[PDB]
Amino acid sequence: GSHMEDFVRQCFNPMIVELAEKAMKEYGEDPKIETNKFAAICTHLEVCFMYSDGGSKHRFEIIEGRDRIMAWTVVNSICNTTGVEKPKFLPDLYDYKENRFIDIGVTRREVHIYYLEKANKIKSEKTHIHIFSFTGEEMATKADYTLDEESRARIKTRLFTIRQEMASRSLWDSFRQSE
Ligand SMILES: O=c1ccn([C@@H]2O[C@H](COP(=O)(O)O)[C@@H](O)[C@H]2O)c(=O)[nH]1
Numbered sequence: 001g002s003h004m005e006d007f008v009r010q011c012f013n014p015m016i017v018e019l020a021e022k023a024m025k026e027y028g029e030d031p032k033i034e035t036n037k038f039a040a041i042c043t044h045l046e047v048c049f050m051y052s053d054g055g056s057k058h059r060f061e062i063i064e065g066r067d068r069i070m071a072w073t074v075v076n077s078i079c080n081t082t083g084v085e086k087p088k089f090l091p092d093l094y095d096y097k098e099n100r101f102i103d104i105g106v107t108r109r110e111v112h113i114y115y116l117e118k119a120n121k122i123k124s125e126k127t128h129i130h131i132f133s134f135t136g137e138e139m140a141t142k143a144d145y146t147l148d149e150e151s152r153a154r155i156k157t158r159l160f161t162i163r164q165e166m167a168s169r170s171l172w173d174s175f176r177q178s179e
């Protein structure tokens, strides 16, 4: 019974918490033990949904939050109908306006460090990358940041609030050092 586990459950909505628990169980991880990661997954989920809510109406297909099998089925449908290259790793969204997959990243460190690690690890010049930090920085493939400033600003605002709530419970340093 960790403080972080109870913090997460009162910080994120129940739909996000339940999708995060499903994800972790599918990874074969336990939210009660790997509690910093439970928090990271919830954060990632929320950002991805707030980001899809930045579009015009039909702009994004949402891949993040589905069951693994259905997630790849939808990836396949998109690849097999837009002719775009099938990514090696599950992305987070598909952008129907710009016809590309996006992988959104949330990091507690330097956005450049994490961008590179992700750049190499995806190994797919095709898939767009967009990184936010808990200090308000972002970095995107080709400096093309997809959404207008307002929709991104509110994401950065929410992450800073999450940081403060953690710091006010002495959970921040432990969560930062665990990445
Ligand atoms: O197989 C996976 C895929 C993703 N993640 C986690 O889900 C979040 C989103 O990953 P990404 O979509 O930014 O790669 C990160 O906090 C990352 O640790 C995993 O633990 N295992």
Ligand SMILES: [Mn+2]
Pocket (backbone or CB within 6 Å): 064, 090, 091, 092, 103
């Ligand atoms: Mn993902």
Ligand SMILES: [Mn+2]
Pocket (backbone or CB within 6 Å): 044, 092, 103, 104, 105
């Ligand atoms: Mn991502």
